[PDB]
């Protein structure tokens, strides 16, 4: 319901309820891992080898074919069983070539239950009795200072939780302009949240056809490995359109020149460095994590006056989200060729 003649100053940067949501989603992410299977019995010597594939010395395969002993239902007996792993999940311990998983020396790992999914469902945050939620209905609003048109509301609108580092996906579009947002633009340690009007459609896919393979560890314990690759061994990627992306970069240059002078050259670059899930944008697509390189998008320079971009991905199977000390998640493989469609909404 609308509320007139009112001037409440807002602040998204010293805002609460983004602090407690960041606490709540981490805590609930942990609460969806207690019924699941621990991979304590799987930290073991691996006897890995190259996958059956045409091999060139210069090129490096992204997959390894690892055989290993594994326990069974019966404590006396054990079984030789093989799986397929990525390069990023195994390291070499040191003729022969025997590996192990990377997280073995720091943390026992937890398989995600394949029954539960990772897709966003929209949360509506609701105020309890004796409080209220105000909403800035203003159009041109950098999130700091007076909002002339506020309105109370029972609950917030649909907030779908996306996990993404760069290029935040499936978000809320702006009304008419493209709005950049910062706490102090003359400072550089604070990020610049960009939100643009017309979304850029991104198409990400994995052309491999995986077969999973249930491996019993113990009584009522199932480890979902990767069986054979059926078809061509290919590299996953994402596609955006060249025209719409160059158009939205033109829009964000046009809006970034409001704070930096009109006679200013604005160029982009790729990331300076860091861990894999901050040098490039990570996301989830149908239950599998992509780390998809963005040096193709953010390469431009701008002067004061049916194609597409194929940008390549990588897939980890273990993750270390929010960088804890003893927590990881072995994401299980999923059947078939996987693809999804998302609307890029904003930037960081």
């Amino acid at each position, epitope marked *: 319901i609308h509320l007139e003649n009112v001037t409440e100053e807002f602040n998204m940067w010293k805002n609460n309820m983004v602090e407690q949501m960041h606490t709540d989603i981490i805590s609930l992410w942990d609460q969806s891992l207690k019924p699941c299977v621990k991979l304590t019995p799987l930290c073991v010597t691996l006897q890995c080898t190259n996958v059956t594939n*045409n091999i060139t010395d210069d090129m490096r395969g992204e997959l390894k074919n690892c055989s290993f002993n594994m326990t069974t239902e019966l404590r006396d007996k054990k079984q030789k069983v093989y799986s397929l792993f990525y390069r990023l999940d195994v390291v070499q311990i040191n003729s022969n070539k025997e590996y192990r998983l990377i997280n073995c020396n720091t943390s026992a790992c937890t398989q995600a239950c394949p029954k539960v999914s990772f897709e966003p469902i929209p949360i509506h945050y609701c105020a309890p009795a004796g409080f209220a939620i105000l909403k800035c209905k203003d159009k041109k609003f950098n999130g700091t200072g007076p909002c002339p048109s506020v309105s109370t509301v029972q609950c917030t609108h649909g907030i779908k939780p996306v996990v993404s580092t760069q290029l935040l996906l499936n978000g809320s579009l702006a009304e008419e302009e493209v709005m950049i947002r910062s706490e102090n633009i003359t400072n550089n340690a604070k990020n610049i949240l960009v939100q643009f009007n017309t979304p850029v459609q991104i198409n990400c896919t994995r052309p491999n056809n995986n077969t999973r393979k249930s491996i019993r560890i113990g009584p009522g314990q199932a480890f979902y490995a990767t069986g054979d690759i059926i078809g061509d061994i*290919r590299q996953a990627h994402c596609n955006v359109s060249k025209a719409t992306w160059n158009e939205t970069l033109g829009k964000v240059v046009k809006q970034l020149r409001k704070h930096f002078g009109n006679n200013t050259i604005i160029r982009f670059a790729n990331s300076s460095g860091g861990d894999l899930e901050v040098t490039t944008h990570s996301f989830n697509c149908g239950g599998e994590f992509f780390y998809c390189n963005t040096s193709g998008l953010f390469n431009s320079t701008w002067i004061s006056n049916n194609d597409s971009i194929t940008l390549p991905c990588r897939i980890k199977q273990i993750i270390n989200m929010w960088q804890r000390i003893g927590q990881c998640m072995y994401a299980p493989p999923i059947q078939g060729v996987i693809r999804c469609v998302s609307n890029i909404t904003g930037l960081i």
Partner: antibody
Amino acid sequence: QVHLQESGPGLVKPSETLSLTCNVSGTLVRDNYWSWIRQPLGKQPEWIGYVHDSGDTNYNPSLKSRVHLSLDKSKNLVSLRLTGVTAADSAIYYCATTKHGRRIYGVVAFKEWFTYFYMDVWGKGTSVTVSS
Amino acid sequence: TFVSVAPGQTARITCGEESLGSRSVIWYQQRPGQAPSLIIYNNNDRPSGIPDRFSGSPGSTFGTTATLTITSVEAGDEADYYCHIWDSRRPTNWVFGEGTTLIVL
């Protein structure tokens, strides 16, 4: 209209460098790839490899050292040198033209393709035999 | 490995290893005493000189064996057939497949 013609010794004493030649008819040596194939009696052929100008000279890695393919741009011929004839080398050998072509199965920029070869016309053969 | 099917009938001549990825097979034939001659240069593509009814199995199929289908056979079809598979996963085959022999009544 092309047809080829090989020429060689036919009688080979062992541990001796075998050499062969191949004439042309119609199409010259620069205009296409070249390839050498061998076939034993009552057997499937064995594609020894291919030669072309500008480094397109990959060999069968089974032999890989005792075989050297060559051209003749002065006289417009093709030639072959072999090294260390054993008893298995008695086979009918073939100079032939071949044509490439890209089988593309995925993204082009990600090198998800390969080039197959196919031999359209052939030579006529030289029944090389090793004997003492 | 000899297959004969009264003249005018059909014949399915298989050759080579079962597929792993995408393939570009090449079919040759060999009249007795002669040189080889190409009949099929792609999975289902033929050059000039060789007529139709010589169909080939496509390379898009995963985990099947390369076949060569002939309808309305003749005594000129009686020769030694050869396959040369080019899989996108296995390395380069510098030697051809196994010699398959056709006979006719």
